[PDB]
Ligand binder design. Structure first.
Ligand code: PQI
Ligand code: GDP
Ligand code: MG
Ligand code: MG
Length: 168
């Protein structure tokens, strides 16, 4: 029957990964969601008229590598690389996330979308230009989002699914 998409949401602590996922799945904003909890969450959506089952891994836990997380990441079909526009370190970290995703997937041209979250905030330290240029270098789309307002949330996950469909 319906197609399942194994999505993974990655990025530095506090960028909005959980707030983004909960918005997509549950349609509300959760301030200060428990930072320890890593889980996968499912939702059926219609995208370009095709019914699809999104299985979304909201990454958390500790800053450590394991063989087990290598294997969970390897099973992911596409990844949202999330930073916050008010957190330059989070944007610098994107490169290291991509490097490790590529390591665990044999350097495949992996479906990835760059996400600049917290776009509602006036305290920007990452210029949109720098994000656009980074996504251009990686050959991936870049979406601006606010989990708080819901701006761009559907576009981020739908674009990733469209990237996975385009890929094979
Ligand atoms: C505030 C907590 C939070 O949301 N975090 C912090 C911990 N963690 C970082 C982290 C580190 C490594 C990896 C990773 C990746 C990207 C690929 C392969 C791999 N094998 N072992 C670990 C690996 C990941 Cl997925 C994460 O997830 C983000 C969270 C964010
Ligand atoms: N203003 C604003 N705050 C956000 C947004 N997304 C998440 N937050 C807040 O940023 C903090 C971290 O979000 P969280 O979802 O826990 O980040 P995660 O660590 O990446 O899972 C929390 O206080 C959230 O309410 C956003 O788009 N705008
Ligand atoms: Mg979280
Ligand atoms: Mg441990």
């Amino acid at each position: 029957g319906m197609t399942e998409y194994k999505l993974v949401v990655v990025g530095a602590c506090g960028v909005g990964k959980s707030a983004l996922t909960i918005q997509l799945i549950q349609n509300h904003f959760v301030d200060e969601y428990d930072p320890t909890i890593e889980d996968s969450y499912r939702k059926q959506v219609v995208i370009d008229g095709e019914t699809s089952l999104l299985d979304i891994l909201d990454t958390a836990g500790q800053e450590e590598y394991s063989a087990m997380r290598d294997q969970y990441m390897r099973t992911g079909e596409g990844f949202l690389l999330v930073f916050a526009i008010n957190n330059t370190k989070s944007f610098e970290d994107i490169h290291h996330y991509r490097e490790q995703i590529k390591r665990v997937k044999d350097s495949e041209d992996v479906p990835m979308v760059l996400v600049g979250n917290k776009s509602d905030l006036p305290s920007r330290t990452v210029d949109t230009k720098q994000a656009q240029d980074l996504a251009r270098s990686y050959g991936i789309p870049f979406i601006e989002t606010s989990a708080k307002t819901r701006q761009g949330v559907d576009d981020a996950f739908y674009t990733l699914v469209r990237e996975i469909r385009k890929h094979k």
